[PDB]
Amino acid sequence: LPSCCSLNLRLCPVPACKRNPCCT
């Protein structure tokens, strides 16, 4: 997804929020 870790920069289970600063 575009920004999965947008309003949730805490965890990152799915790849959608794996590229966000929350994971990287």
Swiss-Prot record:
Disulfide bonds join 4-17, 5-22, 12-23. The modification 4-hydroxyproline is found at residues 2, 13, 15, 21. Expressed by the venom duct. It is found in: Secreted. The modification Threonine amide is found at residue 24. Kappa-conotoxins inhibits voltage-gated potassium channels (Kv). This synthetic toxin reversibly inhibits the insect potassium channel Shaker K+, the teleost homolog TSha1 and the mammalian Kv1.2/KCNA2 channel. Interacts with the pore region of the insect channel, in a state-dependent manner. Causes seizure when intracerebrovascularly injected into mice. Is also toxic when intrathecally injected into mice, but shows no visible effects by intraperitoneal injection. Shows protective effects on cardiac tissue when administered after an ischemic event. The cysteine framework is III (CC-C-C-CC). Belongs to the conotoxin M superfamily. Negative results: has no or very low potency on Kv1.1/KCNA1, Kv1.3/KCNA3, Kv1.4/KCNA4, Kv1.5/KCNA5, Kv1.6/KCNA6, Kv2.1/KCNB1, Kv3.4/KCNC4, Kv4.2/KCND2, Kv7.2/KCNQ2-Kv7.3/KCNQ3, Kv10.1/KCNH1, Kv11.1/KCNH2, and KCa1.1/KCNMA1. Has no effect on sodium channels (Nav1.2/SCN2A, Nav1.4/SCN4A, and Nav1.5/SCN5A). This is Kappa-conotoxin RIIIK. It comes from Conus radiatus. The lineage of its organism: Eukaryota, Metazoa, Spiralia, Lophotrochozoa, Mollusca. The chain holds residues 51 to 74 of 75 of the full protein.
